[PDB]
Amino acid sequence: TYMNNTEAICDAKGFAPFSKDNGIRIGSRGHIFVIREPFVSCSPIECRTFFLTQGSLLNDKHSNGTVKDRSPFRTLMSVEVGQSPNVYQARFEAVAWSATACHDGKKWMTVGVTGPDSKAVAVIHYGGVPTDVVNSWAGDILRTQESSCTCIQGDCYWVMTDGPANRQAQYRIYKANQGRIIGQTDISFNGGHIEECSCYPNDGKVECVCRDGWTGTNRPVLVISPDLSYRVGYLCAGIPSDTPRGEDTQFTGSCTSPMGNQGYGVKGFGFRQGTDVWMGRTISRTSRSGFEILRIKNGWTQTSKEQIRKQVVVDNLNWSGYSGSFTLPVELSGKDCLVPCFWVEMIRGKPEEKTIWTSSSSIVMCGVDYEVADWSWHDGAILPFDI
Amino acid sequence: TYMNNTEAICDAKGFAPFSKDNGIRIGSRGHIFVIREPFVSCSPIECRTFFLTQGSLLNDKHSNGTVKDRSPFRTLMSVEVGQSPNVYQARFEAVAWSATACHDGKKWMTVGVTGPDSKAVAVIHYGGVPTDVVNSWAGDILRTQESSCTCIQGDCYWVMTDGPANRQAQYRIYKANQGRIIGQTDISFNGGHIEECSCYPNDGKVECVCRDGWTGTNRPVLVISPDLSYRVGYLCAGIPSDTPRGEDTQFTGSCTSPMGNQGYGVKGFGFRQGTDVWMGRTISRTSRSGFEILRIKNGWTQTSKEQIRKQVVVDNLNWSGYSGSFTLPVELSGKDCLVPCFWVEMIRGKPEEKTIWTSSSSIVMCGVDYEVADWSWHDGAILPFDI
Amino acid sequence: TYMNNTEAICDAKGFAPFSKDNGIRIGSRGHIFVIREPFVSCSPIECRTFFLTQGSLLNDKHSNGTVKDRSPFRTLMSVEVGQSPNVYQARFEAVAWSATACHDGKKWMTVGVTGPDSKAVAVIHYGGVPTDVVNSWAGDILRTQESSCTCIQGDCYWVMTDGPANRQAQYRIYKANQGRIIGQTDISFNGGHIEECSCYPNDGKVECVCRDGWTGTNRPVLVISPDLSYRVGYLCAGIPSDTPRGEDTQFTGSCTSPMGNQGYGVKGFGFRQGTDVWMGRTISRTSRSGFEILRIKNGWTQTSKEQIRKQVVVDNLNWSGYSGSFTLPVELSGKDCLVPCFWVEMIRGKPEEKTIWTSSSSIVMCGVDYEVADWSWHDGAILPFDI
Amino acid sequence: TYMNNTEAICDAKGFAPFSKDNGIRIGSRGHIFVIREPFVSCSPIECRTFFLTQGSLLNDKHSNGTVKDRSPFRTLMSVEVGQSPNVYQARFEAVAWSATACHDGKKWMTVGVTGPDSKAVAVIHYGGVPTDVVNSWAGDILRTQESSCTCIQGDCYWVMTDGPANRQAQYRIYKANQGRIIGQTDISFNGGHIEECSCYPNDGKVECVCRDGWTGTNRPVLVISPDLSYRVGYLCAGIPSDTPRGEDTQFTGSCTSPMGNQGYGVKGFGFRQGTDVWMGRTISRTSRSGFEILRIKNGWTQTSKEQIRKQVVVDNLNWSGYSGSFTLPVELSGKDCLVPCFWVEMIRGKPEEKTIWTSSSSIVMCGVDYEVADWSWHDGAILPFDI
Numbered sequence A, B, C, D: 001t002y003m004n005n006t007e008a009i010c011d012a013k014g015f016a017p018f019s020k021d022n023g024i025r026i027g028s029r030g031h032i033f034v035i036r037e038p039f040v041s042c043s044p045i046e047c048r049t050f051f052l053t054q055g056s057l058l059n060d061k062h063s064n065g066t067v068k069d070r071s072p073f074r075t076l077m078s079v080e081v082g083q084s085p086n087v088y089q090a091r092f093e094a095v096a097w098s099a100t101a102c103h104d105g106k107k108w109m110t111v112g113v114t115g116p117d118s119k120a121v122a123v124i125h126y127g128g129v130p131t132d133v134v135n136s137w138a139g140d141i142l143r144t145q146e147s148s149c150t151c152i153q154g155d156c157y158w159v160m161t162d163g164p165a166n167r168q169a170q171y172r173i174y175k176a177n178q179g180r181i182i183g184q185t186d187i188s189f190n191g192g193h194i195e196e197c198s199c200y201p202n203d204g205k206v207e208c209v210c211r212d213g214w215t216g217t218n219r220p221v222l223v224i225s226p227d228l229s230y231r232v233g234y235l236c237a238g239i240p241s242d243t244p245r246g247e248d249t250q251f252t253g254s255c256t257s258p259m260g261n262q263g264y265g266v267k268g269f270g271f272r273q274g275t276d277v278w279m280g281r282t283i284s285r286t287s288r289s290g291f292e293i294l295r296i297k298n299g300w301t302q303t304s305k306e307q308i309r310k311q312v313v314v315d316n317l318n319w320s321g322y323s324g325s326f327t328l329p330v331e332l333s334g335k336d337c338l339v340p341c342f343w344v345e346m347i348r349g350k351p352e353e354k355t356i357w358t359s360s361s362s363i364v365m366c367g368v369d370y371e372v373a374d375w376s377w378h379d380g381a382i383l384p385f386d387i
């Protein structure tokens, strides 16, 4: 049966640790894939950790990291949450150097984008087999979320970007059922930029907190309705949650346009709590180091900067990286609301470290009705490796 | 229940990437089988990659490649499509140095040929256990497809060759149900040669594009009816699709006899599109390098050379090799037609490279109603290995 | 359906060997986790071996053992009883440096405690996903059993300790259903100390033989009723079963308070046999070496020292360590009583051996209506390793 | 449901190759258990290869072979037929240095004998958990088949020997249901010796061809009725099938007592074909080298030496070893008779080779209504290994 992800996001006071793979520590001797983007998505039976692979293994010359991100080897694979992205427990998903995945209640739908920069192709898989395709409509590195997509009552939605990573790019919302594209939509967001959206279902709609890699230090936001009508802008919150970014004091929030002159960025996430918001972010305003998660009152609908809670998951002396959102299906939590959870990728090796390779580990957190103490569940690997 | 592979082959405009195992890159450090013929076949629940093993692992002295192809160690094993042919996720199938496999909807039937050259034996397995046998009827290296066989409404069919690899050999069509041979047939094809057939169901019949290793650069073709009556000849298309071969301009197609003086050959495939044809082939007319797939209008029924489409899957600067056909069951694609898919083996090491071993990787493609851009999803391993 | 662990513990005359993983011997070359506390718990379908991991593998520099027990890497994982705690067959359970687990008949519930010493958090998982939380109520290293918890008719119970490891600490009994805490209780035990309880269901109640790390060489005992009412004290038996401890002759048993001036201790277990008792213990009164299991008549209700049986499972020339209790569900043994079983962890490496690492192996035993001969099923690894 | 192994053994004209694991070749680089006795037994869903392990892996110092056969580490484990006895696909069965296993249609029952020589214990497991026990009744190395046991209509039978390996020993037949011993029997066989019986169901009775390690070169035979009544003696056949042994010409068969002065022996098997017999044996009369299988007309009931067929499975230039019988359940072969199959262990390393270890590989064969050509499916590993 299809999954009713119709409920509202549970109001949480903190986040308890879900899992930790320790993929890299384990990689010092085991057979682990050098990965990237260990995002999480759950089926009504289990949560899995998806990731990208170059077909290389840590401590092997193939992890030479000199291989382009968008290479002809990159593939999306997966394991159960917590297990390392090891070769022997891995499930193949799709050829891809950019992907997204979600379960609709019956089968897994995955979307692997591969091919050339000017004419890439995103293959949609359903039940472990390709079912539909999407060709680059703008001929400039077609890409997607790199985190869980969202299925609601049988139809799954996800956001895709095609165009430059600086100036205006083009953004679209896609909708499928059983691996078959049944609807799409162009997003008008002039002056705004959208990349690597972190979504989740909430009150029958799909909410996403994305990344503005053009000129915004605050995160773009777009609420998608099942008929592909939508709203889009920025996390109102008067606090910047991207990286790099400026100081909170020198930031005036905006629900409309991007604020801050910073241009780069990093994938992040955020959860609506009624009118409040849980927003994640690197602790360092300059580096992908540390990871904290703050709750701002009315931060979803107001240029508020009233911090109600601050929970540290990765101290600033440790590397972090991408982070994404996903939801615990009701059939797993046994709740009447959708438990909001997120994952935090922790990057090790190049460029901040002296190794010939680059990979990441992960730590997953989930809702919870209690305040959870600060701590650091960092990677832990001892670099460099035998190389 | 039995699988109704009664439908017609879907008319496709191009092929999207299905999977890539990167077995060899992974083999630099992981425990991977040195394989050969990573052909694909699907059950109504999943598609698997079958392959031959010498019981050796890449980067081990046993991959010494000096072992004869038809050795007493060669065995057929398998994994899910996309996973590498690694020891720990592998399923044993049958003792064999030549094989074929297909699922009828309930269980997997596999056919492993092993034993001596002058008195080989092909063991038929059903549900993971031997059920019937076929002894060399011509006493000269009994062999079969090396790619998926074909089941239609409970009965599975496959082609077998016994006799020299040059002059006339003898060819037969076999038919079984539940691993039990219930019918066979001698193929009259004087002057013609048949090897490593790549088949697939189409309109209730079994179509196969094979290999003429005697004197034809164009591929032999035989349509099998469920009562073992048949038609046989060559892909009409006025373009040669074997390797080696001559230039397209110096080739006059023929649906009847072989054209071209070339004698060797390589396993290939082809898909009927009404009257048109999708024919695969190495890009190089001399080497097993590169891989393209051309669509010729009326090429299935006419000595046509009207190229409607050309899609490159492996550029000519990269090694290729065998390639085979298979179909996506309806119960997986959710289609009303049989999605045509093929696999392309990519050989690395001896003889074209300086290593003491020889193995291959693979990339799988499937139907799709859209034009797919050219690109190259090549092996990627860095040779030589620690040896 | 829920598991009726309502029956009485079977009266056993000895213990037959259940399984042996040989994790460490295997670790000399395979990919095995450096573990700790390989406790066992069973579902109505199978028994699994749970354990703690630092994300390190034997013979790797990460097994450097210098990492704190309560590190941010420690995680609870598991495999089927007898299999080694190898990376490739492991199932992730929860982030933890102290844990407990039991199955209620439908799903697995696990409890991982992690976080900082003064504000640790114990995450309760149900069906492979976090469902509830317990925060340190006494702000001093919250911890639990390190052995199987106990489910009876749908509700699962376990004991937790928060406070110093010397002087008085605080002890609580928790009760959950479907991963949700539905009841708890404070244990009044002034002068008494409770740690690492080894429990099991018996006559509809939960019996536990724990560890007094403050001043008792005899083991504390507490019988929990389903309404969280309880009784607590010490194994009446006139023989000390902790380590370190004094000689049996210089020991006067007590069902009330601790006897013996010794302060440290080690996790142990014990089984009620009507009024008799099976109590395990290191053979050495000073070291965690050897392992024997004695049956004392009326030792559960009387300060008796009448040894009816003595069975050696690990000779005194071999290292032992922790040991815990668990029960064979009725649906597996086919019995009408709950077969009492225990596991014996065998520690190798630091501090008693010269290696840079420390890990353990295990051997599991179960009830049985017959006397079983003495023998030694010790670890067996040859130290040191390549390091 | 229970398995009706009531049918007769199929009349076969030869044996087709079922599987080959190549465990040792694979072990040169992969993680494989140094094993012994890779016997096969099938459930109504699959056939598995069981084996003994020292917890050691090939190419590791623990495979030092100096460890006693009956050590405290030896354990029975298993994988699916054809897969190598690798650590990562292995299933733990029972602590044992001698074992037997069979499936009754519902669950797997296994019997692991372990413990000391003068007081060994055989633990019976059912459904992956210990259910009953058998203690040495004669106090001198209790042991069993080392090959598949036999279940018929719910009750499983197996033979056990306790006593010296030379002079008279004591032999018993055991009968269980659901892992519970429900009947046993003493075998009167004065002057006769029984070891490592290879059994199989035939016409509602259990037939076994065993090993006389005292004074017979011909194999002892005992037909067990479901009520534990029985018949016992020797394979009538006028040809010796043990190793060592004398020449066929200098042998006068006997259905009664042992013939030949030779004393040692090796585990073998044999299949009744009405009145005829298929008997296996090393080709060399002196060494465990080569393996052939001869069919003697009326050899089961007459001192006949009329060889109807001779099929070689392992040439005399290659090492062999133990061999055992098992049957293909009807629910797998789809036959109306029980397909007779056997396995041939191939030993490599000490004592015949210069390595510090000793292990074996295997090749499985099954019934088949056709004559199968001679060939050799030998081990294949290249010795010595990195050591």
Ligand SMILES: CC(=O)N[C@@H]1[C@@H](O)[C@H](O)[C@@H](CO)O[C@@H]1O
Pocket (backbone or CB within 6 Å): A061, A064, A066, A356, A387
């Ligand atoms: C340890 C190692 O192999 N590092 C190599 C480095 O030597 C080389 O210059 C570079 C460019 O190909 O690739 C990797 O960085």
Ligand SMILES: CC(=O)N[C@@H]1[C@@H](O)[C@H](O)[C@@H](CO)O[C@@H]1O
Pocket (backbone or CB within 6 Å): B061, B064, B066, B356, B387
């Ligand atoms: C690296 C290696 O072992 N190569 C060997 C080569 O030395 C040898 O001459 C040949 C013939 O046996 O087999 C392999 O090619």
Ligand SMILES: CC(=O)N[C@@H]1[C@@H](O)[C@H](O)[C@@H](CO)O[C@@H]1O
Pocket (backbone or CB within 6 Å): C061, C064, C066, C356, C387
């Ligand atoms: C073999 C090895 O790496 N041992 C190291 C030792 O050298 C070092 O002094 C200590 C402190 O960091 O950690 C480990 O004991």
Ligand SMILES: CC(=O)N[C@@H]1[C@@H](O)[C@H](O)[C@@H](CO)O[C@@H]1O
Pocket (backbone or CB within 6 Å): D061, D064, D066, D356, D387
């Ligand atoms: C290569 C190796 O470690 N072989 C050892 C040998 O040196 C030793 O004398 C013997 C007795 O312990 O055991 C093994 O045979």
Ligand SMILES: [Ca+2]
Pocket (backbone or CB within 6 Å): A211, A212, A213, A214, A215, A216, A217, A218, A242, A243, A244, A262, A263, A264, A265, A266
């Ligand atoms: Ca930015």
Ligand SMILES: [Ca+2]
Pocket (backbone or CB within 6 Å): B211, B212, B213, B214, B215, B216, B217, B218, B242, B243, B244, B262, B263, B264, B265, B266
């Ligand atoms: Ca040719």
Ligand SMILES: [Ca+2]
Pocket (backbone or CB within 6 Å): C211, C212, C213, C214, C215, C216, C217, C218, C242, C243, C244, C262, C263, C264, C265, C266
């Ligand atoms: Ca103590």
Ligand SMILES: [Ca+2]
Pocket (backbone or CB within 6 Å): D211, D212, D213, D214, D215, D216, D217, D218, D242, D243, D244, D262, D263, D264, D265, D266
């Ligand atoms: Ca003998």
